[PDB]
């Protein structure tokens, strides 16, 4: 209830003019008071439209100002161009910055003037420094200046922060004011005509530096930020890679005193085990060389901070390092050229000096692993393999973005990347031919996409036709299903919605064991992902072909085989300016349904093969192996205690044993710690990487101005929990400026806290971080009922595409390829279902969401709507609340810290109740209705749709499920069986969980199965209305948790809920009209 004041102050500061007037608009759920709000509105519009003073009416309608609820504030201020500079001149009295062209290796990667690299605009491209975000540099500068101005009179520790950040913004703005501000167009791009006479890499550097200096709360933060901002102005290729590299060695220096374990995918069972740190000497020499490079780059304070820690090597001073490890990834992306980014991968050293004893075993192990995956379904003749064509054709929506191709749906032209749409086009024109897999050769090389991530190399992405997906789909789904229960596939061991994300190293760490962990992300152009890898799979397919008797299955397997034949020789379109290069690359990368699990297989075979060579010199028992994409780790135990010399010799043997297969590696062996892309451990304590740029993005998405603010808030919350903390008021300023909308040149609207923080398709953030807010009031209920009426909108593009002839042909072909003779009873159902997977195409979503925002805006302008009784969540909570009673409690501390970097209140909760131990289905995947969909398809259907579908009669359930690819007999059996009644409750569980972010954010980290939380939640049991007692216990838990988060202290509860209200609510249960935005979720693991 504080945000709107900051909004008002932002408006007053940014505009400042006599002509700048400020126009609130209010609402109340009570008619008479609402008409007085309407009156105030009216009179304000008039007064605005007559240059009359507004300050007089504000007393007359005092009641509305005190008790009614605000919506938004309008603003009439003219163009008044270039006022940002006219304000900014004062904060730029420092010295500007000079580039240094002889730092980056390349020529165009220096921060020199555009004209020195692109004299003509016809060869200009802003894509090497495009922020790719619908928010301006000017927005950032205005926000910083507003923060600095309002915090210009404080006298505390805050002032010690303020002087520091003021100096940082001085350093930045001197450099900016030296030349000027680039001006955004309507699309938030930056054209040639502003950058023609200015440095090319000023924008990303500026934004990244603003984000960093806005995340300063301490002295070391100031040192680090000043030491990166001033060097990131020139160095743009060897900086985040530099400071983020030693961490991998540092984790091998922290003694464990106390540990965490994993059992099943979120279980913990702590251990007081102590483990020393047997680090060799030569890795210190390596580390010393790395610090010499660090100092050689122009870094002074942060080596000293890295140097004074080694005197003790303690874990209490260690979070600084972790903090440092996150300060490296908030400098921006290294958006270099497609060519030079491919050549990070396309350097090959293929040699007729590798072993042959190794590759044959490698090939065989891949073959054997494949056979273990596929023995059962290939043999028992599963339906999903026979009809693999139809399976992939349904599951196209869960695929990659194919190359743009010109379509026509009746009377339009489309350049879609979605392969389902490609299929729709090719069926009509006789071009659909899935059995004949295209070659990939000189006559038709392959396109590319670029998988980027800062501080590392650029990975490549295949962008293929739609036959490759269809071939790989069914076989890869059975392989993944097999890997759900296999432990060693770290990407895929789960229980249908989880990953082993807290690792499985710490079981067998001891004084006798060691662990070798290894980054394997560069192993795409390598000689072990070419020929042997493919041929092992070919061999497995031969065996599997002899392991079935049906012909459809053998054909499907032969098509998958033929796909691997074509992938063994594969060329690659790569432009460079005007001319086009094509390079032989017959190997593996991402952009495929198969790449992930198959790379995991190949790394597993590789490490199993290598690890049987250390056996020539050591006796050990392989206890555990894990492989997940861009990393892999294996633990191993000895007959004795570990020494430095065994570590050194093992490392040399591992390095040379990879060299025997012609494979480069920075081999890393340790005893207590690991480092990988997504996480790392020191001293039996899990830390995480907070490297998600907020004000700069990887590539250019498709979301609106609105939703990118929500994405940024989720990333903000995440990074805060990780450790990287930014000052929240700046973020709120960005959110309001990104939700601000221009109705004319001078009219602009700004919504309020009570529109943006309400559970709908328009939620963006919360008034108090780590806490969703609900509505006990009339007013939040009122607007939630209003916004649900408006969330449902239309897309004319989708309506006209579904009315053409080709779509109709596609629906007909789906039917007669699946079932026939109900052409007007189910086929229409299948069209309505195909509509559910046209929405992946982005412009449809933009049409629909822009329509939602405009419909929202035409009642943000004018007064409010009653919305006609449509029941939602706050209606229920309104009725649950008046039979509560709170009382002060006092819980003790009995749970262990294992995420130090958290804010102290969340940690206090974790340090008093447990951390989560299960993961209950956000999708309802284990639900008996969903185990059909995961059997005949991959398709999601959103929990809104399922929660709705179950509310209907037993007739249209059959239509809706058969329309999702499922056959008719099992649907009829499901309805006759009466299993939906055994699944109303699970679906509603998942629904309510999706509505309230229970599996999305901070609430993913908390134990609701605790005995300590439960004894506070004293709601007696009634029985035979399970939903009510369920929601009551859940909501009471949420009350206690929100009180804990927002105030630190604890409370109890009690609800002697009357049976009358139990029954009144039981009927309100399965008629809920509520919804939560996809863009608002904050997955802690990305």
């Amino acid at each position: 209830g504080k945000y709107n004041l900051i909004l008002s102050e932002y408006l007053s500061f940014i505009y400042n003019s006599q002509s700048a007037v400020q126009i609130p608009i209010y609402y109340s759920s009570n008619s008479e008071l609402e008409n007085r709000c309407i009156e105030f509105h009216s009179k304000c519009l008039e007064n605005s439209k007559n240059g009359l003073s507004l300050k007089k009416l504000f007393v007359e309608y005092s009641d509305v100002i005190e008790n009614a609820t605000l919506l938004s504030i309008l603003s009439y201020s003219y163009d008044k161009y270039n006022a940002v500079e006219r304000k900014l001149v004062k904060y730029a009295k420092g010295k500007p910055l000079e580039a240094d062209l002889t730092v980056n290796e390349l020529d165009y990667e220096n921060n020199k003037i555009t004209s020195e690299l692109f004299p003509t605009a016809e060869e200009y491209t802003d894509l090497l420094m495009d922020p790719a975000i619908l928010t301006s540099l000017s927005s950032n500068l205005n926000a910083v200046m507003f923060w600095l101005e309002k915090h210009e009179n404080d006298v505390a520790e805050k002032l010690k922060i303020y002087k520091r950040r003021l100096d940082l913004f001085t350093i930045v703005a001197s450099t900016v004011n030296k030349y000027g501000v680039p001006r955004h167009n309507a699309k938030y791009r930056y054209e040639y005509e502003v950058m023609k006479d200015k440095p090319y890499y000023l924008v990303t550097w500026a934004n990244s530096s603003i984000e960093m200096l806005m995340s300063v709360f301490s002295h070391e933060d100031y040192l680090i930020a000043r030491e990166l901002i001033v060097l990131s102005y020139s160095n743009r290729s060897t900086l985040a890679k530099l400071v983020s590299s030693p961490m991998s060695i540092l984790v091998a220096l922290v003694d464990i005193n106390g540990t965490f374990i994993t059992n099943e995918e979120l279980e913990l069972e702590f251990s007081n085990k102590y483990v020393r740190a047997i680090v060799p000497d030569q890795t210190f020499d390596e580390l010393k060389q790395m610090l010499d490079n660090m100092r050689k780059a122009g870094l002074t304070d942060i080596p000293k901070m890295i140097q004074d820690w080694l005197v003790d090597c303690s874990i209490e001073k260690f979070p600084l390092m972790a903090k440092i490890y996150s300060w490296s990834f908030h400098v921006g992306f290294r958006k270099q050229k497609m060519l030079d980014a491919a050549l990070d991968q396309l350097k090959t050293e293929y040699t007729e000096d590798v072993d042959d004893e190794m590759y044959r075993e490698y090939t065989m192990l891949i073959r054997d692993e494949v056979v273990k995956m596929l023995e059962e379904p290939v043999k028992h003749d599963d339906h999903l393999l026979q009809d693999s064509e139809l399976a992939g054709l349904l599951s196209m929506s869960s695929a990659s973005n194919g190359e743009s191709r010109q379509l026509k749906f009746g009377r339009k032209t489309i350049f879609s990347t979605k392969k389902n749409m490609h299929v729709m086009d090719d069926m009509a024109n006789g071009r659909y031919t899935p059995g004949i897999i295209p070659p990939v050769n000189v006559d038709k090389p392959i396109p590319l996409g670029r998988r980027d991530v800062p501080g590392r190399r650029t990975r490549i992405i295949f962008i293929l036709p739609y036959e490759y997906f269809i071939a790989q789909h069914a076989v890869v789904e059975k392989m993944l299903i097999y890997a759900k229960h296999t432990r060693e596939y770290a990407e895929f061991y789960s229980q249908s919605n989880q990953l082993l994300s807290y690792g499985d190293v710490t079981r067998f760490l001891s004084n006798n064991s060691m662990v070798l962990y290894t980054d394997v992300s560069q192993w795409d152009s390598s000689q072990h992902n070419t020929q042997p890898f493919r041929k092992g799979i070919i061999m497995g397919l031969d065996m599997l072909a002899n392991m079935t008797n049906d012909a459809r299955v053998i054909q499907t397997l032969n098509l998958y085989k033929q796909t691997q034949i074509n992938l063994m020789d594969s060329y690659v379109q790569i432009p460079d300016g005007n001319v086009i290069k094509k390079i032989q690359y017959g190997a593996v990368a991402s952009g495929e349904k198969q790449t992930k699990a198959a790379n995991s297989i190949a790394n597993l075979a590789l490490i199993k093969t290598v690890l049987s060579r250390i056996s020539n010199k050591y006796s050990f028992a392989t206890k555990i192996i894990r492989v997940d994409g861009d990393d892999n780790y294996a633990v191993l135990q000895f007959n004795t205690e570990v020494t430095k010399q065994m570590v050194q010799d093992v490392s040399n043997d591992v390095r040379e044993t990879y060299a025997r297969m012609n494979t480069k590696v920075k081999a890393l062996v340790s005893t207590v710690g690991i480092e990988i892309a997504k996480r790392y451990i020191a001293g039996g304590k899990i830390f995480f990487r907070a490297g998600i740029n907020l004000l700069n993005n990887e590539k250019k998405g498709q979301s609106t101005q609105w939703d990118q603010a929500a994405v940024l808030y989720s990333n903000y919350i995440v990074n805060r929990l990780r450790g990287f903390e930014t000052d929240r008021e700046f973020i709120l300023t960005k959110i309001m400026q990104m939700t601000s909308v221009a109705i004319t040149g001078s009219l602009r609207l700004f919504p309020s806290e009570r529109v943006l923080t309400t559970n709908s398709t328009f939620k963006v953030f919360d008034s108090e971080d780590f806490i969703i807010e609900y509505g006990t009031t009339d007013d939040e209920v009122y607007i939630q009922r209003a916004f649900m009426s408006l969330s449902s909108q239309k897309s004319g593009i989708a309506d006209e595409i579904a009315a053409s002839s080709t779509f109709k042909n596609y629906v007909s072909r789906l039917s007669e390829q699946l079932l026939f003779s109900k052409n007007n009873i189910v086929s229409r159902g299948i069209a309505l279902t195909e509509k559910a997977k046209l929405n992946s195409y982005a412009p449809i979503s933009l049409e629909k969401r822009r329509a939602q925002i405009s419909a929202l805006l035409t009642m943000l302008q004018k007064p409010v709507t009653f919305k006609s009784s449509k029941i939602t969540i706050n209606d229920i909570l309104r009725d649950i609340k008046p039979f509560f009673t709170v009382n002060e409690a006092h819980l003790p501390i009995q749970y262990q810290k294992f995420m130090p970097t958290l804010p102290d209140n969340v940690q206090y909760i974790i340090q008093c109740i447990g951390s989560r131990t299960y993961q209950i289905e956000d999708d309802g995947s284990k639900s008996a209705i969903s185990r059909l969909i995961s059997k005949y398809s991959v398709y999601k259907p959103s929990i809104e749709e399922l929660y709705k579908v179950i509310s209907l009669h037993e007739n249209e359930i059959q239509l809706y499920l058969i329309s999702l690819g499922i056959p008719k007999i099992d649907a009829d059996t499901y309805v006759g069986s009466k299993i939906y009644s055994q699944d109303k409750y699970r679906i509603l569980e998942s629904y309510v969980y999706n509505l309230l972010s229970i599996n999305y954010g901070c609430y993913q980290l908390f134990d609701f199965n605790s005995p300590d939380l439960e004894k506070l939640i004293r709601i007696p049991f009634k029985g035979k209305i399970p939903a009510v007692t369920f929601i009551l216990h859940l909501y009471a838990k949420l009350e206690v948790i929100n009180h804990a988060i927002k105030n630190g202290s604890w409370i109890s509860l009690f609800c002697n809920y009357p049976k009358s209200e139990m029954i009144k609510l039981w009927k309100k249960m399965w008629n809920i009209t509520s919804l939560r935005s996809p863009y608002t979720n904050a997955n802690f693991f990305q």
């Binding site: 740190a277 140097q307 080694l310 005197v311």
Partner: peptide, 28 residues
């Protein structure tokens, strides 16, 4: 520079001494 670096190398030998190694070294 290098005085503190060499002292880090030396003091990161005295610290974290393994016992079996000094036994085999006395033996060797």
């Amino acid at each position: 520079n290098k005085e503190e670096s060499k002292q880090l190398l030396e003091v990161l030998k005295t610290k974290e001494e393994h016992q079996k190694e000094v036994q085999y070294e006395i033996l060797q």
